[PDB]
């Protein structure tokens, strides 16, 4: 953790120019990583949503939960990336592929906010990881990341673009419960 720059904190806030935008490689996001899906469900992170219910007027508790509880599902429990493999835990079962970086994809919401997927393949054909995985994670420039959302799927880079919904989430393995919640109150 450098401090961010001006332009790097802005970014994470969604306000950046295309011309700013950089590539990465996937060692920004070597490490294992939990799903925080469990934390959701446990009720682990409701005093995010209290909080986040309470400073928003127009949110009730269960629109914040649901929103979430839609974004994290999933039953890629661990990830572990490492000299350019990405490993996916589900049920005691591991799949493993080579990931090659395919570039990035700047995306505006609704809002007028922007972020940044960075998109990777799998073209070894012994694997049986998603053909196509990309990262999101706040950050539009080389940096290593502090916690990412991953879209996943064999069917084509833009069917991932056009995903808005789930987004299973992943925070380094080694923090505690506690300080997952603690990150997700702030940042
Ligand atoms: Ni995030």
């Given at each position: ?9 802005k ?15 996937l ?5 294992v ?22 400073a ?13 509880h ?13 000299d ?5 835990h ?75 919904e ?13 300080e ?8």
């Amino acid at each position: 953790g450098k401090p961010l720059t001006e332009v790097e904190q802005k970014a994470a806030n969604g306000v950046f120019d295309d011309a700013n935008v950089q590539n990465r490689t996937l060692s920004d996001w070597d490490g294992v990583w939990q799903s925080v899906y469990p934390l959701l469900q446990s009720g682990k992170l409701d005093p995010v949503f209290q909080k986040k219910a309470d400073a928003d007027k127009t949110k009730t508790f269960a629109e914040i939960k649901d929103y979430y509880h839609k974004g994290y599902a999933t039953d890629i429990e661990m990830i572990g990336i490492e000299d350019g493999i990405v490993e996916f835990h589900r049920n005691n079962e591991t799949t493993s592929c080579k990931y090659d970086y395919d570039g990035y994809k700047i995306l505006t919401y609704k809002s007028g906010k922007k972020g940044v997927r960075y998109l990777f393949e799998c073209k070894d054909p012994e694997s049986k990881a998603p053909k196509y995985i990309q990262f999101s994670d706040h950050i539009i420039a080389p940096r290593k990341s502090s916690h990412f959302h991953i879209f996943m799927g064999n069917d084509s880079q833009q069917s991932l673009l056009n995903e808005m919904e789930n987004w299973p989430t992943y925070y380094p393995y080694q923090l505690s419960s506690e300080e997952v919640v603690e990150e997700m109150m702030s940042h």
